[PDB]
């Protein structure tokens, strides 16, 4: 296949979480949630994430309850069996922008914006692909490229023509921690956030892995000593043969 059909391969960026012993940067995760909420969430759902999931990762219990309580969710029917709404709770999932696929496609010139909860695992490249894609819209398509109507040129996307236009521009978000919201900064934060959404066990997993590595290595060393100890009578055996 041509390189265009594959898509350009994203650079390997030095993410804070790259590194056997490295967690996510939680300040970046929190900023990335704010980019998601103010930019991506207009078209993209995050359906696998509940409000409780933010708590003690990016937000306190109170902040997350406040986010949940601002929304309305379907309650159980009332006593006459009529539909009712209730305010959100921490157990609720973050609600998506569209009621169904048909509505999503209608709002996006036929294209369906994927749910972003697993996107960092569902694409080769992970965070690097998300960062490269969001920051990789050239001002002008390479001469000779014919885009289908409603497509935008992006070399990272396979085939080059993506239905999502560029959305991150300097200062579309005002971060609450005073960080300059440049295109690059926002793409980095949201790519970190989405990586966390895909693999929220990441930090715990790598710490447990460190404990396992240490114990298993020591056991490997001791198992070598013990095997050699037990085998030495066999290895050291000597023979004298006197032919009968």
């Amino acid at each position: 296949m041509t390189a265009a059909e594959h898509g350009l391969h994203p650079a390997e960026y030095p993410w804070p979480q790259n590194g056997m012993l490295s967690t996510f940067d939680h300040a970046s995760l929190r900023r990335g949630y704010q980019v998601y909420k103010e930019v991506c969430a207009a078209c993209h759902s995050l359906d696998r994430i509940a409000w409780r999931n933010l708590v003690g990762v990016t937000h306190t219990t109170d902040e997350a309850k406040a986010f949940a309580e601002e929304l309305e969710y379907d309650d159980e029917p009332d006593d006459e069996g009529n539909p009712r709404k209730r305010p959100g709770k921490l157990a609720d999932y973050i609600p998506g922008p569209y009621p169904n696929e048909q509505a999503a496609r209608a709002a996006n010139q036929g294209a369906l914006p994927p749910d972003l909860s697993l996107i960092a695992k569902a694409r080769h490249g992970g965070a690097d692909y998300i960062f490269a894609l969001l920051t990789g819209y050239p001002d002008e398509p390479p001469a000779g490229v014919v885009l289908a109507p409603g497509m935008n040129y992006n070399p990272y996307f396979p085939g080059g023509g993506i239905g999502m236009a560029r959305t991150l521009f300097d200062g579309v978000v005002e971060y609450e921690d005073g960080t300059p919201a440049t295109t690059s900064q926002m793409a980095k934060d949201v790519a970190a956030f989405l990586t966390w959404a895909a693999e929220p066990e990441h930090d715990e997993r790598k710490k447990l892995g460190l404990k396992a590595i240490i114990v298993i290595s020591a056991m490997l060393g001791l198992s070598v000593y013990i095997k050699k100890f037990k085998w030495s009578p066999i290895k050291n055996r000597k023979f004298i043969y006197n032919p009968p």
Binding site: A50, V215, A218, M219, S223, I226
Partner: protein, 56 residues
């Protein structure tokens, strides 16, 4: 000598000790899958109104 034997039992004992600690960790983490999952634990703390409820 007793020191000679003691050394080899220190190696055997250490190995037995890490195997005990590793088995305990393995069993505990693994079996915890059977305890209430996060979504189940999220369904407690039911809030109930009282205004609708008549006397008697």
């Amino acid at each position: 000598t007793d020191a000679n034997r003691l050394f080899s039992y220190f190696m055997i004992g250490s190995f037995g000790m890490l195997s005990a600690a590793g088995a305990k960790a393995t069993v505990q983490d693994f079996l915890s899958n059977m305890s209430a999952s996060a979504d189940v634990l999220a369904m407690a703390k039911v809030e109930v109104k009282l205004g609708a409820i008549p006397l008697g």
